Structure formats: structure tokens, C-alpha cells
Amino acid sequence: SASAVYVLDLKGKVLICRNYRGDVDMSEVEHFMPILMEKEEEGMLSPILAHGGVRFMWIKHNNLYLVATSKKNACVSLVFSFLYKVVQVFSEYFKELEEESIRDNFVIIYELLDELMDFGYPQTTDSKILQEYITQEAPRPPATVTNAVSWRSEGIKYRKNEVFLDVIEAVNLLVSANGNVLRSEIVGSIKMRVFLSGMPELRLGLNDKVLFDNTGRGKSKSVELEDVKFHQCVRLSRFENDRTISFIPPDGEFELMSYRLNTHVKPLIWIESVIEKHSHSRIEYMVKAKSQFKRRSTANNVEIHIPVPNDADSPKFKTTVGSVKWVPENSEIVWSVKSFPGGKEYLMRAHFGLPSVEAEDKEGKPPISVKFEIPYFTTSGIQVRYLKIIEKSGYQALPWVRYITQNGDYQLRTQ
Template identity: 70%
Template sequence: MSASAVFVLDLKGKVLICRNYKGDVDMSEIDHFFNLLMQQEEEGLVCPVMSHGNVHFLWIKHSNLYLVATTNKNSNASLVYAFLYKLVEVFTEYFKELEEESIQDNFVVVYELLDELMDFGFPQTTDSKILQEYITQQGNKLEVSKTKVPTTVTNAVSWRSEGIKYKKNEVFIDVIESINVLVNANGSVMSSDIVGSIKLKTMLSGMPELRLGLNDRVLFALTGRKSPALLTKLFEVTKSVVQDEVSPGNNVLCVCVCVCTGDKGKTVTMEDVKFHQCVRLSRFEGDRTISFIPPDGESELMSYRINTHVKPLIWIESVIEKFSHSRVEIMVKAKGQFKKQSVANNVEIRVPVPSDADSPKFKTSTGHAKYVPEKNWVVWSIKSFPGGKEFLMRAHFGLPSVETDEKEGKPPITVKFEIPYFTVSGIQVRYMKIIEKSGYQALPWVRYITQSGDYQLRTNN
């Protein structure tokens, strides 16, 4: 079960708009939400789920709004929260910025969207591209499209319209991996993981079927292949087409997928794999083929997480000397611990400095450094950082002559970067097969990107 009703409130708890989907919860129950929220804030503990009697409030805050769903059943909380965040996404697509003024100025559009997004407490059409085909707006007024309601609303392929045409048919595939690393002051990696996603930009005519193959070790086992050397025969797996129904809603695959990195059979385990609703799960579970009819334009085909030990790609060593009543000197050395043929772009190394520091002076072996006083850090920017290289940055700050007794915390050094044509996990797109009844030729393009996520290195200084 999902939500009984959905409310949008301002920061004072006033209802701006609401939609009653099931009628099994008194709409006046929302009056208790804000009192419960204020009570919890006073106690210093705010819970995402609050209850009044047998009525439960599930809520999120966005900008100057509260989005609240009510239910009196044992509902699927994950589904309710996914729907609330989807509301934010759809409203943002329509109004660019979602805030109180957006709701007030576009009341009719918002109500129409609430009516289409959910039916009797269950999510329905939640793709903003499809919604925009028949719920359009000009200024602050709702304009009902003169054309008939798209068949995507009622057919099995609810995420793609019929009759799409392109002069040049192309598919762009981005494999993006973000590295999360926490290194302690002794130089040991305390935690690390990889969060990845495969994103598509589809510019294809008609209603094509796509089949995507990864270097999936489970596929080797199912087809009797034990070595990455046999990957050239992977097309044989896709000769037969399984005519299975498209699963509705988001497809979350609760299994682990082993991916061969190509390094002498070394494997990693992909966890929390989540597919777009267009992917045929039964086909994937049968022969590991990712088969789907893609949405038009940009979409995220799948996401995954790899919980593994990751060697920091950019290693940072720092020495900070603080001279009482005088100055502080900072020396930072950065080393690229990735392949020499790769280059990290737009590297930013943020080094914390004392809040009372002034009169900055810098010297760098490459790039440039600047002081950001409102953040109390130095940003060392390096446009291009080749693998295997080392660079130095020295900073000198003056300190006030009056010593304070305040003991400041020691924020970590944080690093931002992006490495194109490179993935840490070694996941690779082996093929993309495009099948369309007209038989046109289409070009698939693949790009790999590794970027920093939550990348922190603690210091002793």
C-alpha cells in the first residue's frame, strides 16, 4: 500500500495544496503534523515518520516546503519516500525551482500533476517527459494539449512515445563511477567504495530494442565461458529473443553481479543494483542480457555500488606548522596514484586553515592556489594532473598576536577530480546491439568517467 493523501505545506505548516487519493484518512489530521514536528525539534530529535493515533505522516523538506504523505496502513515506506522525491523531481522539471511561490503561481498545473502521478494511493505516470506531452503550461496557465492523450499513458511502454524520428540515429553511453574514500591521519584507508551508474542519451527513431552486454563473469559461467579472452563471442548469446513482459515501476535487482575486471580473472561484486523500469528483469536473470526499449533522450539505465578496498587515486601528504602569535606555514604534496596514460582533470584540493589566519602567500609547482576566508580553506586548483606525477603547494599565513583559548577542530583535506576514459572497477561495455523493424543503422558511443565522491583525508596537524 502507498499514500492515502499528499500535502504540500509552507514553513509555518499551512497547507498550500493537497490531494486525497483514498479517502480513508481524515484530511484534518494534517493539522497535527506541524505540532508534532515542532515538538520533536524542541527535543532535538526529528524523525522522518511521525504518528498521531493510527495515522502516520511520512515527510520530506525541500527548499521552503514540506511534502507530506499520510496513511493509516502498514505502507511501504520506501515507496512513499521514492514518490515524494519523484514529486520534487517532476515539479522542478516543470517550474525550474520548486518553492512556495511555484506552488501558488501554478496551482492548477500542480493539481493536475498530482492527479496523474498517483491513482488511489499507487504511483502511475511519473515520467515528466510523458506528462509534458499532455499537461503543458504557458506562463501560469494550464493548456490542455489539442492532440489526443499519448498512448504511452496506457500501453506497456509508458516511458516512450511512438512516432519518434531522427535524421541520425545514435546512442551515447556514459559509465560514471564515483569514489568515496576516507583516509585516517596515519595514512590507512578506513572506508572506501565505488558508486556507479550507466547513463544513456538515446536519439533513435521508432521503437527500437537495445541489448547491452557488460563484462559480467556470471554470463561467462552461464554460457560455459571462463575467460575474458572469449568475450568476442558474446554476440552469440543474443541470437534468441525472449518475449517477456516489461516489468512496471522501477526494477531493483536484489542480487549481486560479479564483474570481471580483465585482470587475470579478478572479480568484484556489484551490490544494490537498480535498473530503470524499461529493463526486462526476466531476461537479465535468464542469460544476463540487459534488454530494453529505451526512453527517448537522457535517462539512467542502471546504478550499482561496489564495496571494495580502493587505493586513493590522488594521495595527499600535508605538513602544517603553526607558530604562536606569528604565522602558520602549510606544505601539501599531491601524487597521482593511477595509470600514467590517464589524466585527472579539474582537480581541486581543499586544505583547511585556522579561522583567524590572514595575509595569505602561495607558491605552487603547478596550478594556482587561492584563499577562501568564508570557508576557512585554501583551494589548490590543477587543471590537468597526469598519473604518476607529484606536485607541491606551499602556503604562508599570518596569525593575530593575541592567542585565543579556543580549540578548533581538524577538518579533513578534501579532493575533487574527474578522470575520463577510466573506471576503477574495470567494468566495460562489451557491446550494444540495436534492433528496429525498419533496419536502420545506428551508432553507439561509449564514454568512461571516474570522479571523486566523498573523498576525505584526515591530518595530524
């Protein structure tokens, strides 16, 4: 239950404002930015500020503070999911979202905030359907905005019939400095790119553990999906009965399912870092990167960020394979390796100076955080098995898939 969706910017001037209820005054937004500066300059920052009896829910995009006030017992999960869906609608019209798009597209952004929300209750936010009666270039609203299938305008025609999948893994890791592994979870995201003709009914079938157990095949390779979060398009009752994933797809790119499973197997890339930090003199980094994964797959463009001290100087970098740039904007040495085969072990030795007069404040210890990307290689072992195109028209479509492992927050705590 939002009251007034604003768009602020980094100074406190309103790029665009649009109140829905009138239960919050319009000059309450001028009280936002001093309250945020006050709550941030004492460390009590929160997404829910408080100016008397008006609460400021807000998210912070690139330049934008999409503040949306309320007054009552506001449904905060609804307000924040609506703010990130406003961010996604703007970024699907305007390919970046900065101040240079809000002051140029007030023809269409007031129409969007007219359309998305009424009285505080979000009602039509699927952008691929919203591109059909709110344009920057009006007819009747489509029957998609009415009907139960509210994400797919009927009558889409392509010459070819291609369904592109992307079973993109994302290994999380958080290795404590003693050497043991704390949280090693994997967040996959099957991210489709659909190009079909009509109103199809796909039936995606994974190698889900509960499906292989209800069938009777509980001794082969089966991924154990701990929690699965689907898109809207997946009918969830049929998924809850017998683990069948049936969905009428949208047209374009979206995130079909976002699974998450834990893993008690070794990390993929392991970073044994030491630090010879003499006080007032220098520091050394005999960091080695052993690739625990299979010998066949090649970790494209790993970037082992390694946090140096803030004021280090005059570096030296004896590596084995791969360039080292010292990035002092971030105070880290981004040790890049382009082709990093599985089973190898590449060693690096940085060497800095250090200022002789000591610092004034302490700095903290950020983690070594790699940026790896191993294609054709699923860590959890999920295998897509089929994708049944069902269409009343009747045709042979061409499904496709590829496999990527990435990093999630692949961090490793330091000395």
C-alpha cells in the same frame, strides 16, 4: 500509502496541498513545523515525525519540505520513493524547483498531484510520457500509460539515429587519519541519452565477470559487478538467467544501470596532509597531492577542499601548481588545480594566523574532500562491448559512449 501530499516551504506555510484520502485533517500541516523545530532543537531529528497518531514523512528539497502525512501502517519506502519521484517530475517540468514555481504553476501542479497518485497509490510517474496529456501549454491518454511498455510513446521519429552513453564512474574513498584506506568503492552509473526511431530492443553487453565466466573467458580483463541496479526498462528475468541486458529505451536522458563494485587497488588522488597547529598562534598545511593513476590521462579541475579552522585569518599560500582561494563561507581552502597529470606530485603550503583569545565551542574535524574528474579513464575497467539495435523497421543506428571518472564522496579524514 500516502494520505495528503503537501508542499511546504522554509517557514511552514503551504505552497500547495492535495489530500488523497481525507484520513488526515488539512490543518495538521500547521502542526508540522513546530514539531520539526522541537525535534531538531534536541537532536532527535528523523524523517518520520509524530503528532499523536499522524506520521509526517517528509523530504527536504531546496526551499521545499515535501511533507506527505499518513495515519495507518504506511509503506514508508513507497512514500519516500514517491516523494523523490515527485521531486523528479517537478524538476523535469520546472527546470528548478523553488517557491517561485509552485505559486506560478498551480494550473498544472494540482493536475500533476491529481495524476501521479490516487488514494495514496502512485500510478503514473514517467515524466516523458506524462508530458503528453498534462501540459502547461487535453487529448486521450496514450496507449503507453496502458501497455506494458510504459515509458516509450510509440511513433517517435528522428532523422538521425544516435544512442549516447555515459559510463560515468564515481570513486568513493574514506581514508582514516592513520594513513590506511577504509572504504574504497566505486559507484558507476551508465547514463544514456537515447535518440532512436520507433520501439527498438537494445541489448547492451558489458564485460561482466559472470558473463565472461559462463562463456569461458575467465582470464582476461573483466569487471566484477558486485551489485547492479538497472532501470525499469531492463527486463530483469533475462538478466537473471544468463546476464543479458536487454531493454526498450525511453526517449531522453535517464540512468540505465547503477553498478557498484569494491576496489582493493590504490586511491587515484592521495592527499598527505600535515597540520602544525600551534595553539593561539597559527597553523600550517604542508599538503601534497600525488596522482597515483596512469601517466596518459589528465585529471581535469581537481579541487582539494581542505578544512581550515573556523576563525583563521590573514592567510599565505605557497603552492607549486594551481591557484588557491580561501573560501571562508565554508571554512576551507579550495586548492584548485586545472590540469593535473597522472604521476606528478604538486605540493601546497597554506599558512594562517589564529586568534589569540581562544574559541568558545569546539568545532570538529571535517575531511579533506577532493573534487576530481578524470575523463577517458574508467577506474574499475568496465568496457562496453556492443549495443545491438533491433528494430522491425530496420536501420543502422549510431551508438556512442564516453568514459568519465568523478568523485563520489572522495573524503579523507584529517588529523
